[PDB]
C-alpha cells in the first residue's frame with residue numbers, strides 16, 4: 208500500500224492521486240498488478256503503466272472491476288503542449304462520463320465500437336497545475352474488465368477528428384472513482 212504519488216514498482220510506472228477525503232486504499236502488486244479498495248471515498252485515480260506513454264502502444268489488461276457508484280476503468284493519460292487528459296474507457300459504474308458531452312465520432316477497435324467525445328475542464332488540477340484544458344474520450348459500448356487496447360486506433364481517430372495530442376506524459380490503466388465504493392484488481396502489460 209502506498210502514499211499518493213508516482214514512481215516505479217516491479218518495472219511499471221504508477222500514479223496514485225486522491226483528494227484526501229479518505230476511504231480509498233491503493234496497492235501495488237507483483238509485476239504489472241495493482242489493486243484498489245474503496246468505501247465511501249472522495250475523488251481518486253490510480254493505476255500502472257508507463258512514463259512516458261506512446262502513440263502506438265498495445266496495452267493489455269486483465270482482472271476484476273467491481274464499482275458501486277461513480278467509477279471508471281480506462282486507459283488514461285496526458286499529453287503536454289497541448290495539455291490534454293485522455294481516456295479510453297473500458298468500463299464504468301453508475302455514470303457514463305460522456306453524459307451530455309459533444310460526440311465527435313466513432314471508432315471500432317478491439318472488439319467493439321467506441322463513441323468519441325471532447326469535454327473541457329475549467330480551472331482544474333492537472334499535471335502542470337491549475338488549468339483549463341480539453342479531455343478526449345473513447346467510451347467502449349461493450350463493457351469489459353479484461354482485454355487489449357490498440358491505442359493507435361484511438362489516437363488516430365481522435366487526430367482525424369481534430370483532437371490532437373501533444374507530447375505524451377504518463378499512460379496507465381487506471382481505476383478512477385468519485386465519491387463511491389468498490390474493489391478492483393488489475394494486471395497490466
Ligand SMILES: O[C@@H]1[C@@H](O)[C@H](O[C@@H]2CO[C@@H](O[C@@H]3CO[C@@H](O)[C@H](O)[C@H]3O)[C@H](O)[C@H]2O)OC[C@H]1O
Nearest residue numbers: 222224251252292328331332333334335336383
Ligand atoms: O504534485 C502534482 C500532482 O498532484 C499532479 O497530479 C495530477 C493532478 O491531476 C490529476 O488529474 C485529475 C484526475 O481526475 C480527473 O477526473 C480530473 O480531470 C483531473 O484534474 C492527475 O490524475 C494527476 O496526475 O501531477 C503533477 C505533480 O507535480
